[PDB]
Amino acid sequence: DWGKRCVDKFDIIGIIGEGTYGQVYKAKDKDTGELVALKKVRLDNEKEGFPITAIREIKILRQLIHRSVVNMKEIVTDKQDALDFKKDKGAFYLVFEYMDHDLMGLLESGLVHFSEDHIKSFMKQLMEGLEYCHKKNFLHRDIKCSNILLNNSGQIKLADFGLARLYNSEESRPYTNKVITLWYRPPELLLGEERYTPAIDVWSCGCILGELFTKKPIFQANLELAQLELISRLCGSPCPAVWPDVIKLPYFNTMKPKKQYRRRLREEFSFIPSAALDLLDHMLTLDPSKRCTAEQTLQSDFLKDVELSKMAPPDLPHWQDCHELWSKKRR
Amino acid sequence: PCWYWDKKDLAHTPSQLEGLDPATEARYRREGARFIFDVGTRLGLHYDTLATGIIYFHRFYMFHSFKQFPRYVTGACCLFLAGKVEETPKKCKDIIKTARSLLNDVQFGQFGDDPKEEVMVLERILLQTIKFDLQVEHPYQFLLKYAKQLKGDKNKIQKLVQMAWTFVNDSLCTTLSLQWEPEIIAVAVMYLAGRLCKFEIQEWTSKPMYRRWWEQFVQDVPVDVLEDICHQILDLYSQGK
């Protein structure tokens, strides 16, 4: 019975930013004391009202309770016009777990350099959350560095499920296609694929895996065509040899790179650890069918034995568990 | 949260307890439900989008009276949310264009001065009323998944689910969505479509001698309960198709 509780339950600390729907605030709860993120859903009438972005998020997060995902704790509302109603204008507040930093903010400093053991730890967590989403048939469709949050305890959580939609393999209907930020957008979406696979998120995580080593985004264009060449300049050009079913893609024969590049990936990322390069090579395959799945990423030599298990030292107290919610997720 | 009542408890809605003729609630419900079904298909919306809006509607009036909330405006609001939920959203402008259009001019009077506001502002309490439980499943999904696991002649199946499907469309005007899980309703319409067509359904399953074929999809569901769902639907053809 969400939306009944009061915001007076929460002591607001500060404004984190303007979000995809209204604004995002940091706040603590006067009852427990644990800190919380609040997404303000200001309801605008004479427009379209309750945003789908807030709806996609709610619908999915109430089915996703996992360690590597910022979980939605509850929903709370403003005041209570016990008279009239119809006067409205009150907002709804989405209550999430709180993370201090995002990977984009940290990497922007040029101060933080993650050791291989950390990247091994970060990816293992990330690919475990995405594997969970895909196991429950949800596409994130908006995976970027600014959407990958990180607290001081080392814990990674995937955020912003405002573009996330349910997926079935029976190819039910065309999707939006113009999804994901241009820099983290896979080749098939650039060529105009409408009915896409979960392997689009795996591409984005791969582009982030390369960014953790190079300390800079590996694909950085401004227009869609120029982005394809940058990919071709590294992963090789999309063509029937490397990729059987590109011919069935709409903008292929029209949107071509300058030459038929030979794949130069292992050459430009040669400084990267061997097993890490093996994973990056796989996560950044042109043909989505030959691309790596999230389930498979955790079976790579680079992630397979990365022990995130909380029995080995050290004991981190500030780690946000989810077995409270998951247990409570019986009701 | 739970969204399923037993038959003994549905005679205790806030509407009726406030002194309402049960026969008129069924009217208001069958009317309101059918209203959504028509407004949706005219806007050209998916069938699951139609059903979620209807199930929202049925659920809403289990916590509110038809007196305090005009039957026809709520249904419009339910469809508005449902469009956004099932990722087939229409602007509220386009639905109000259907609100005046397919409807009695005094039935349109329910929306008051500004249908937009009356629909848009209502959304706030609708979301709160359904306890922010936005994902809803339907007998449609299970009907197909069960018929795909049936091993016999296709053109018998093709006609089997052809009439079982329509039955789900029929049932939406009633509180079956408020009575049984969508899987069990899906089993029931397979049971019914199999009887009136004289198709014996077991003979297409792994065990052709267990008469109660359905337990291969569900668990321990009695033939009694299944016949209850069937009867409630038979009354629909008896009066309003």
Residue numbers in the entry:
A (entry chain C): 718 to 1048
B (entry chain D): 22 to 262
How is this structure described in the published paper?
Human CDK12 (CrkRS) and its close homologue CDK13 (CDC2L5) are unusually large CDK family members (1,490 and 1,512 amino acids, respectively) containing a central kinase domain with flanking arginine-serine-rich (RS) domains. Recent work indicates that these CDKs regulate transcription via assembly with the 65 kDa cyclin K1 subunit (herein CycK). Ser2 phosphorylation is required for transcriptional elongation and is performed by both CDK12/CycK and CDK9/CycT (P-TEFb; the positive transcription elongation factor b), which are identified as orthologues of S. cerevisiae Ctk1/Ctk2 and Bur1/Bur2, respectively. Here, we report further structures of CDK12/CycK complexes solved in the presence of AMP-PNP and containing variable truncations of the C-terminal kinase extension.
